[PDB]
Amino acid sequence: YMGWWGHMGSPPQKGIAGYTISPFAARPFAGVVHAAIFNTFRRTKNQALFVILPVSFFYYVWTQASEKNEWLYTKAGRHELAKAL
Amino acid sequence: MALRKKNSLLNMANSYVLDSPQPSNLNYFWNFGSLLALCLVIQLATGITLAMHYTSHASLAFDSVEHIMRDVNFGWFIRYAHANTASFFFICIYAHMGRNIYYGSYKTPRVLPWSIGVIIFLLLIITAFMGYVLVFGQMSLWGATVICNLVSAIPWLGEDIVHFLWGGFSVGNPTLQRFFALHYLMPFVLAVFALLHLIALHTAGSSNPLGITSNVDKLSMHPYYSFKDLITVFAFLLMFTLFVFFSPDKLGHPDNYIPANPMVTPASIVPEWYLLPFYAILRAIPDKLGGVIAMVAAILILLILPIVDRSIIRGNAFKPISKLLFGFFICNFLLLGVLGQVHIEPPFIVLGQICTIFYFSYFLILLPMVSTIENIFFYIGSL
Amino acid sequence: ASITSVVKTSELILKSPLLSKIVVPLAKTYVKFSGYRQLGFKMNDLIIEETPNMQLALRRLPPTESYDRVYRLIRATQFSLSHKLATGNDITKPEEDDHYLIPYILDVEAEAFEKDALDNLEVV
Amino acid sequence: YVKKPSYKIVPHFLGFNIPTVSKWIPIFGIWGAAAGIGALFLIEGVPRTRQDILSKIPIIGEHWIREIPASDNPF
Amino acid sequence: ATTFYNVFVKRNSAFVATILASAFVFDMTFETAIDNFWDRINAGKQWKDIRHKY
Amino acid sequence: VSPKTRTSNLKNGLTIASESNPLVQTATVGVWIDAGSRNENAYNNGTAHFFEHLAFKGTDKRSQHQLELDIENMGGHLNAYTSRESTVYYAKSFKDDVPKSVEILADILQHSKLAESAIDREREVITRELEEVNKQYEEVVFDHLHATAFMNQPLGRTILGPRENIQTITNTELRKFITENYTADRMVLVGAGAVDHDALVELAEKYFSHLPSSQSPVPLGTPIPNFVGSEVRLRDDTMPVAHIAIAVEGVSWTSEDYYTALVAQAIIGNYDRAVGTSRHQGSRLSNIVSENNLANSFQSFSTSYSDTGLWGIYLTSENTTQIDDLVHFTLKEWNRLSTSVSNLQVERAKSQLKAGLLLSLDGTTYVAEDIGRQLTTLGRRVTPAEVEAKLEAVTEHDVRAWAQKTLYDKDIALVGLGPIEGLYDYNRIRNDMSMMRW
Ligand code: HEM
Ligand code: HEM
Ligand SMILES: CCCCCC[C@H]1C(=O)O[C@H](C)[C@H](NC(=O)c2cccc(NC=O)c2O)C(=O)O[C@@H](C)[C@@H]1OC(=O)CC(C)C
Ligand SMILES: CCCCCCCCCCCCO[C@@H]1O[C@H](CO)[C@@H](O[C@H]2O[C@H](CO)[C@@H](O)[C@H](O)[C@H]2O)[C@H](O)[C@H]1O
Ligand SMILES: O=C1C(O)=C([C@H]2CC[C@@H](c3ccc(Cl)cc3)CC2)C(=O)c2ccccc21
C-alpha cells in the first residue's frame, strides 16, 4: 500500500506545481508572534470543549466521591458509614 | 547508485532512518515512537550498568541497591535515571497508544503493527514489574507475591504454577534471582518486538493526523523527522532532568525503601503509577479469576479495536462525536488510575466498578455504536 | 464497515419521514462541526482507501476527478502541517461537497458482495 | 421449460458456510485430541497431573502410583 | 494396509495425534524399560539394593 | 432427445454404428480403430503414425494422384488421426457421396500400396515433423507428460516415435502392423448425419467384408500401467510463457470413478484470460488466478485410456516470478477436493457437466467422434439418459472419496516448459498435494 520513492503509489499527479524556497532564504520565525497568539488561540478554542467536557465531568465525579469519602470517616458520617458497610 | 542504497546492510538502515518516506504532516504526537526508542536505549544503558553493580541474591539485593546509591560513582544518577525512565517509558507508551487510538492507527492496513504493539505493551508491563521486584523492598516483595499469584486464577494447575514461578513456597531468594534473569532478558525481547512492529508498519507507512493517504505527499524521515524528534528528545530530557536531579523520588513509593519483610505487608498498598488503572480494575471485580481476567482483558481488549471500530473514516480528527467519546474514555482511564491509589473504602468501591464497566463498554458498545452513527451522519450530512 | 452498509442505512433514514425530519438536521450540523470542509476536503476524500476494494474504486475515477482528488489531499496535507485552515475558495462549500466516489465504490462492493454470495450458492 | 435457475444462497460468514465447516468438524475433533494428548503428555511430569488424572486410568494408572520409601526421603 | 494409511496417516490431524500418542506410550514404556535394565546392569550396587539392610 | 444410435455387426466382427440426423445434409462416415501407438513395441514405435501418412499415398487400384482426384470429386474431405489408443479415418461428404467415401476408406485401409518409394519419401516428411511439433507447446508438454508419467511403458511412447525408428521402418513391418491390428473386431464403421443405417450396413457388407478377423477376438475397449511420480523440466528462458502440466494417475474409461473424476475436473475447471466470461467463473482456482493475474490460462483435463489415465491440469503463465504461487494455489484447490468439497461445488459441477457432455456434440464430425470414441472404449454408445443417471449418482461424498484416494498426498507427474526458473523443485510441489492443516 505504500511504495517507495519513484513508485510511491500516488494516483497519477498532474497539474500541481509546487514551489518552495530555500531554508536559508526564508525567515524560519516569520510571523511567529501572530501564530503564537492568534493561530494557537484559534486551534485551542476549536478543541477546547473536547478536553473541558470530560475533564470537568470526571473532576466533578472525583470531587463528589472524595468529599463523600472524607465525610464518611468523620464523626458526623458514622451512621452513613455503618450503612455503607 | 548511492552506497546507502547499494549495500544490503546500509540499505536496511537507510530504509528505516533516512530514506523512509513519511507523511509530511505528522504532528508532535508522532514523536512518542522515537521517545520510546530513547527510553528503551536509556533503560538498556542504565539497566546494564546497574546490572554491573547489583546483586540478585535476596540477602544482598536491597543492600546492593543501597550500595549503588551510596558508593558507586554516579550510582545515584544511574539508579534514578533507570527508575525514572521506567515512569517516562509509560507516559510515552500510553501517549503513543493514545495517539494510535485517537488517529485510528489500529485500522487496516495497520492492524498488524497495532497487534504486535499490544504485545509490546504487555511485555513492558512485565519487564517494568520484574524490575520493580529486583529492589526487594517491601513493595517489591509484595508485588512479586501478587503477580505470581495471578496464575493461581488458572484452575487446578494454577497453585502448582505459582510455586514453580517462585521456586519455593513463597517469594524468596529463588524468585528474586529468576526475576533478575528475566528482567535483564525481557527488554531485549521487547526491543525485538518494537522492531517487529516497525517492520510490520513499513508496509503501510505511518498513518497521519488526517487519516487520509499520504502517498500523495511524502517527506524523507531525515532530515525532517530526525530534527523534529530532537525537539522532543530535548523536551523529554528536560522533564527527565527535573525528576532525576531535582525530585528523584516523586514518582516512587516510600515503602520500597524498607527492606522486604515477608511477615507484614504495608497497610498502604499502591503499585506503580502506571499499573494503577489495571490495579483498580482488579480491585473492582470481587472474584479471584474474574479480577484477573478483567485486568488482563483490559489490555487484550485493545486487540479488538480493529473489529469494533466500524468507521469508514480513519481516526478522530474529523469525527466530533468520536472525539468526545475518546475524551471520556481517556478521562475514565485516568479516573481508574486515581481510584487505584485511594483506600478501598466507600464510595470509591462502587465508583471503581462503574469506571471499570465504562472502560469495557467503550470497546464493546459505545465505539461500535458511535462509529456506525457517524458513518451515517457523514453520508447524510454531506448529501 | 462497508460503504454499501452506510449507504443503504442512510437511504432507510431518508425514506422514513419522521427519521429524516430528526436526522437530516443532526447530520448537517455534525458535518459542519466535523470541519473537514475547512481543510478543503470533500466528504469522500476521507474514506479509508487502503483496502483492495477502495483501491479498485479509486482506479475507476475519471482522470479529472482523480487529479483533483490528489490536489485536494496535497493541499489538505499542507494545511494540516502548517496548522492553518483553508480560506476563501479553498473552503469546501456545501454545493461542492459531491459524493464523487460513492458511485464507484458502491459498484466495486456490489460486485464483491455478489461474488461472496454466489460463491455460496446451493443448486436446489 | 425452465424460466430461472433454481438456487438459494446458503448463509455464510467470512467466507465460511455451514456445508464447508461441517466437513471440517471431524478434523477439529482430531486436532483437539492431538492437543489433548499432546498437552497431557507435556504435563505428565507435573505431580498434580499424575495424582488427579493419570493414576486414575484403569490398568495403566499404576504406572504413576509410585511412593518413595520414607527411609530414602529426606523431606 | 490401505486402511491403516487411511486411518492414521492420511489426515495430518490423525497422523500428529498418532505420533503424540505413540510418543506418550514410548515415553512411558522406555522409562520403565530403562529403569529395569539399569537396575539389572548395576545389580547389588545401588541404594535400593543395600537399603534392605537398614 | 437425440435419435437412437443404431448398431449392427458383420460376420467378421466389424461393428457398424450410426446416428442419423435428417436435419443436416452432410455425413461423416469413418472407421474408428481400437489400435494406436500403444500397440507398437519399442522397435516399431512410430509405425502407426507412419501408416497414417502412407494410407493416402495410394492403393493397389488408385494411385496417389487418382486418390486425390477421387476425393476432390466427392466434394468433402478425408481426415485421419493416430492417438495412443485409437486411430481414426473419416470422410466428411455430402449425403449422396457416402457410397464413394466408404469405398475410398475401405480401399486405403485394406489395399494400401506401401511402396518402398513412398516409404522413403515420407521418411523425410515425418522426420521433419519431429522438429515442428516443437512449436506446439501444449503437445510438447503433454508428450513429455506421458513420457514421464508412464516411464518406459507403452503409453509413455510418443506417437511420432524416435528418429531412429523412422529411419528403419520398412513396408514389411508396416504391413505386419496393419495386419495384426486393423482387424474387423477392432474397428467400428461410424456414420453420423445424413446416413441411413441399413444403407451403411450394406456398404460395409460390400467393402469391409474381406477384413481379417483376429485369432482371439476380445471385446472393444479391452486393454500394466504403473504411473511414475516424476518431473521433466524443459527450462527455456527465451520463451515468454511457461507451460506447466501436473497430473496424477487418473481413471480409465471403464472405471467406476470415471464420472467422479469428470466432476472433480469440472470443479477446478478451465480458465482463459482471453475469454470475457472467465473472470466470473465460479471455480475457486479461477477466482484466485484471475484476481492475481497468475496465469494466462489453465485447463483441467482427465485423459482416459483403456487401463489408466491422467488427471491433471495444464497451466500457462507469463507471470514468471509467481509461478510458485500459481502452482501452490492450484494444488491447494485440488487438496480441497479431498478436504472441503460439499454439495455446493459438486452440484454446481454436475449441472455444468450434465450440459457439457451433450454440448460437445454439435456437428456430424463431433457426433461421429463421440460414437466412435464410445464404441472403441466402452463397446457401446452410452445414451444421454444413462450419462445423466451416472452423473446424478456422483455425490459430494464420492468426490471426496475419489480425491482422497487419487489426489491427496499422491505422486504427481509434473512437466514444466519454458521460463520455469520460479517453479520450485519436485519436493516442494509434491508437498502441496496434502494439507498439514487437515
Ligand atoms: C517499546 C515500545 C515502542 C516503541 C519503541 C515504538 C516505536 C514506534 C515508532 C518509532 C513508530 C513509528 C513512528 C510513530 O508513529 O511514532 C511507531 C508506530 C506505531 N506504533 Fe509503536 N512503539 C512502541 C510501542 C507501541 C505500542 C505499545 C503500540 C500499540 C499498542 C504501538 C503501536 C504502534 C502503531 C500502531 C504504530 C503505527 C502508528 C502510525 O504511525 O500511525 N507501538 N511505534
Ligand atoms: C524496558 C526496559 C526496562 C524497564 C522498563 C525497566 C524497569 C525497571 C524498573 C521499574 C526497575 C525498578 C527500579 C527501581 O525502582 O529501583 C528496574 C530495576 C532494575 N533494572 Fe530495569 N528496566 C529495564 C531494562 C533493564 C535492563 C535492560 C537491565 C539490564 C540488566 C535492567 C536492570 C535493572 C536492574 C539491575 C534493576 C535493579 C536495580 C534497581 O532497582 O535500580 N533493566 N528496572
Ligand atoms: C539504525 C537502524 C536500525 C533500525 C531500527 C532503529 C530505530 C529506527 O528505525 O529509528 C527510526 C528513527 C524510528 N522512527 C520512526 O520510524 C519515525 C517514523 C515517523 C515519524 C517519526 N517521528 C515523527 O516525528 C519517527 O521517529 C524509531 O525511532 O524507531 C526505533 C524504535 C527503532 O528501533 C527499533 O525498532 C529497534 C529497537 C532499538 C527498538
Ligand atoms: C538490531 C537488528 C538487526 C536488523 C535491523 C535493521 C533494520 C530492520 C530491517 C529489517 C527489515 C527489512 O525488510 C525489508 O528491508 C528492505 C531493505 O532495505 C527494505 O525495503 C524498502 O526499501 C527499499 C530500498 O530502500 C525498496 O526497494 C523497498 O520497496 C522498500 O520496501 C524494507 O525495510 C523491508 O521491505
Ligand atoms: O496488588 C497489587 C497489584 O494488583 C499489582 C497489579 C497492577 C497491574 C497488573 C497488570 C496490569 C496489566 C497486565 Cl497486562 C498485567 C498485570 C499487575 C498486578 C501490583 O503491581 C502490586 C504491586 C505491589 C503490591 C500489590 C500489588
Side-chain angles (χ1 to χ4, degrees), chain D residues 33-34 37-38 41, chain E residues 4 8-9 13-31:
Chain D
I37 291 157
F41 179 45
Chain E
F4 195 97
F8 292 102
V9 179
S13 61
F15 190 46
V16 164
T18 298
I19 288 156
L20 292 179
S22 296
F24 215 151
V25 162
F26 169 86
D27 204 74
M28 293 311 106
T29 53
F30 190 54
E31 185 254 14

Side-chain angles (χ1 to χ4, degrees), chain B residues 13 16-17 22 26 30-31 34 37 40 191 194-195 198 206 221 225 228-229:
Chain B
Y16 277 84
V17 305
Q22 299 293 336
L26 300 182
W30 262 256
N31 282 31
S34 66
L40 194 38
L195 173 69
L198 287 197
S206 297
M221 167 79 213
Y225 291 108
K228 189 138 154 289
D229 289 333

Side-chain angles (χ1 to χ4, degrees), chain F residues 92-145:
Chain F
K92 203 175 175 103
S93 57
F94 216 77
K95 169 189 153 183
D96 40 39
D97 284 318
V98 157
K100 276 167 205 61
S101 44
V102 169
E103 189 267 312
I104 283 152
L105 284 166
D107 203 23
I108 67 172
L109 289 171
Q110 290 163 38
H111 305 297
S112 211
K113 259 202 305 295
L114 311 170
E116 293 114 75
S117 66
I119 322 279
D120 276 301
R121 191 146 37 260
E122 278 320 276
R123 146 149 51 217
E124 302 144 34
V125 180
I126 285 158
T127 283
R128 211 195 72 254
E129 266 180 310
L130 275 180
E131 293 106 19
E132 277 156 347
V133 68
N134 78 306
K135 202 48 207 69
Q136 279 305 306
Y137 289 132
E138 181 168 348
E139 283 189 56
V140 165
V141 167
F142 276 88
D143 287 330
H144 280 91
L145 183 75

Side-chain angles (χ1 to χ4, degrees), chain B residues 122 125 129 139 142-143 146-147 269 271 275 278-279 295 299:
Chain B
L122 277 160
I125 282 169
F129 207 65
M139 308 295 273
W142 291 104
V146 301
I147 273 129
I269 281 274
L275 297 184
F278 319 104
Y279 172 63
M295 187 191 62
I299 295 166

Side-chain angles (χ1 to χ4, degrees), chain E:
Chain E
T2 309
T3 304
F4 195 97
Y5 170 87
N6 282 328
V7 174
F8 292 102
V9 179
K10 176 176 65 190
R11 311 161 163 87
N12 197 43
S13 61
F15 190 46
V16 164
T18 298
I19 288 156
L20 292 179
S22 296
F24 215 151
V25 162
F26 169 86
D27 204 74
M28 293 311 106
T29 53
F30 190 54
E31 185 254 14
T32 289
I34 292 304
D35 287 354
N36 299 320
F37 172 73
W38 186 256
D39 294 349
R40 281 204 255 108
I41 56 184
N42 296 290
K45 286 216 298 216
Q46 297 185 288
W47 167 253
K48 81 176 72 188
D49 303 306
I50 66 166
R51 194 214 296 122
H52 66 91
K53 292 196 288 267
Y54 321 111

